[PDB]
């Protein structure tokens, strides 16, 4: 009310400004555009590096004594003597499994049953989306050849941002599309039970007490997404050893 | 800790290598922030033309066009504000106390200005923003007061700079280094305002003392730095980008 009933010439000024405000929206609109591309632009540079990690973990490729050499220094330079060697086994056993158990928000969601499943997790990829709605996809690559639970070769999660940018000029999470799972046995089905793999089956928009609850998990869902995106994937290595903590 | 320590010779090496791949990962992330910085700078050059445009509309320097006026109402109604609607019927110079009223709402900042600071901010015409561009990445906020009206200080532009330490953070993004304010030149110890608790102390950022070690004075002068950087964030990513609504109260 400290503006409603006041001078006119003033308000008049505001109206024009309110217009230039809109001009910013479109300018900030174009911003997020090239902004999104830049990120995806470098993701293609991260993948090759992470792919290397995948094979090194899956044992599909032996470590390069050079990488081992540089590792010796790096680890020493970071005062992480805990990972050194002075004077058998396949790829890093239970890599992402351990890395996730150290990830703040995620770790808690894993159960003793779904933990044995994540034991076959080989890698977690990332891909943005310009294929329509803004967003990204978290591809979980499991070892189908050994996974006794589900035959699925690649599980995933897709977060979508509503076309229209929010007030802040940024994106706003619209909803998430789970990549579901095809278990080969109910007894082997960890997921209804409180399981981690329910992550691929997030809550939907439509459905007191209801919204209040169906919003906390909905919020927790997006929260987890960022954890894997801005942390787990980028610093997966440290997340496994625990240095990221 | 003892978990990784008991890892087999084979295992460890497997980690050592990965620890290296991450280093190579750090390398690319470095270039990411680079283009990320430049790109974000590119668009700022596009934001200014609009802010520099509104500044005049705020200083009564330039007058609104009937096109913008009408176009505005169509927006006020579209957003359902009404507060910006004029009455049916066929005074001052460029909207009085604009930025003042604006900062009066901004969450973090609003609770910094005092009755003796309000009179000063009453002469604030605009709040700019610019990325250092050159050496040492960072942004600098510029405050332009009416030198021919401001009775407190002769300064025309009070600046503030936030330097991002060259060394990229662990997360892969920029990390603060220290704030370098632009000292003010008051025209009278009475019209000083700033030692008491004042808003303009914002132009006299806390200095990273030394490694002489202290107690409660390292935590206190830490919460202040956080507040300093915090305030800087507000103005940059909010106040400026949506000054219009911050004045009305919609941004709230």
């Amino acid at each position: 009310g400290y503006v409603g009933g006041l001078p006119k010439n003033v308000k008049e000024k505001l109206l024009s400004l309110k217009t230039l405000q809109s001009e910013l929206f479109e300018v900030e609109k174009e911003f997020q555009v090239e902004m999104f591309e830049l990120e995806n632009k470098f993701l293609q540079k991260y993948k090759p590096i992470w792919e290397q990690r995948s094979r090194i973990i899956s044992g599909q490729e032996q470590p390069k004594p050079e990488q081992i050499a540089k590792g010796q220094e790096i680890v020493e330079s970071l005062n992480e003597t805990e990972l050194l060697v002075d004077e058998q086994v396949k790829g890093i056993p239970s890599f992402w499994l351990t890395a996730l158990e150290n990830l703040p928000i995620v770790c808690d969601t894993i159960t003793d049953r779904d933990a044995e499943v994540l034991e076959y997790l080989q890698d977690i990829g990332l891909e943005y989306l310009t294929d329509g709605r803004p967003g990204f996809k978290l591809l979980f690559r499991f070892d189908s050849s050994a996974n006794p639970f589900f035959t699925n070769d690649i599980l995933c999660k897709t977060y979508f941002y509503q076309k229209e940018l929010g007030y802040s000029g940024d994106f706003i999470y619209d909803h998430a599309e789970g990549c579901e799972i095809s278990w080969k046995d109910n007894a082997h089905n960890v997921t209804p039970i409180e399981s981690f793999f329910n992550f691929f089956d997030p809550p939907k928009i439509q459905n007191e007490e209801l919204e209040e609850d169906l919003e906390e998990r909905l919020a927790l869902d997006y929260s987890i997404g960022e954890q894997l995106k801005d942390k787990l994937i980028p610093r997966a290595v440290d997340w496994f050893t625990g240095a990221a903590l | 800790s003892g978990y990784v320590g008991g890892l087999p010779k084979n295992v460890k090496e497997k980690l050592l290598s990965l620890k290296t791949l991450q280093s190579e990962l750090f390398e690319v992330e470095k270039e990411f922030q680079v283009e990320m910085f430049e790109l974000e700078n590119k668009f700022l050059q596009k934001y200014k033309p609009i802010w520099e445009q509104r500044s005049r509309i705020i200083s009564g320097q330039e007058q609104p066009k009937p096109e913008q006026i009408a176009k505005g109402q169509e927006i006020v109604e579209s957003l359902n504000e009404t507060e910006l609607l004029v009455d049916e019927e066929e005074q001052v110079k460029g909207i009085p106390s604009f930025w003042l009223t604006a900062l009066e709402n901004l969450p973090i900042v609003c609770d910094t200005i005092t009755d003796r600071d309000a009179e000063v901010l009453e002469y604030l015409q605009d709040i700019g923003l610019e990325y250092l561009t050159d050496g040492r990445p960072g942004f600098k906020l510029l405050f332009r007061f009416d030198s021919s009206a401001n009775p407190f200080f002769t300064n025309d532009i009070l600046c503030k700079t936030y330097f991002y330490q060259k060394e990229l953070g662990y997360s892969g993004d920029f990390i603060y280094d220290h704030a370098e304010g632009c000292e003010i030149s008051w025209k009278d110890n009475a019209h000083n305002v700033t030692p008491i608790e004042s808003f303009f102390n914002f132009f006299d950022p806390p200095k990273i003392q030394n490694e002489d070690q202290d107690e409660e004075l390292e935590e206190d002068l830490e919460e202040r730095l956080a507040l300093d950087y915090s305030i800087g964030e507000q103005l940059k990513d909010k106040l400026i980008p949506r000054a219009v609504d911050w004045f009305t109260g919609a941004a709230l």
């Binding site: 209040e212 919003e215 906390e216 | 969450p107 973090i108 609770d111």
Partner: protein, 89 residues
């Protein structure tokens, strides 16, 4: 007071958050209590016919508004704040 309420929430419950609606309720609580106390202090001033509202009118306004025990602490925290405030120079 969203932020100021969040900080306090961390001083008592570091591992506890708060929803948007819950925050809106807390904001109303603060503004409500504020107006109540200030409302009294205002009267106390007029009653005693004084043109100033010091920490004195605020204190008593707390004894009249807040219940026994609850008002007690309020008087404690308030008196302490004023004591420490004046000290800092």
């Amino acid at each position: 007071y969203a932020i100021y309420v969040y900080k306090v929430l961390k001083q008592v419950h570091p591992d506890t958050g708060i929803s948007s609606k819950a925050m809106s309720i807390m904001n109303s609580f603060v503004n409500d209590v504020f107006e109540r106390i200030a409302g009294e202090a205002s009267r106390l001033a007029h009653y005693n016919k004084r043109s100033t509202i010091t920490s004195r009118e605020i204190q008593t306004a707390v004894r009249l508004l807040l219940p026994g025990e609850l008002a007690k602490h309020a008087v404690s925290e308030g008196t302490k704040a004023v004591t420490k405030y004046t000290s800092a120079k």
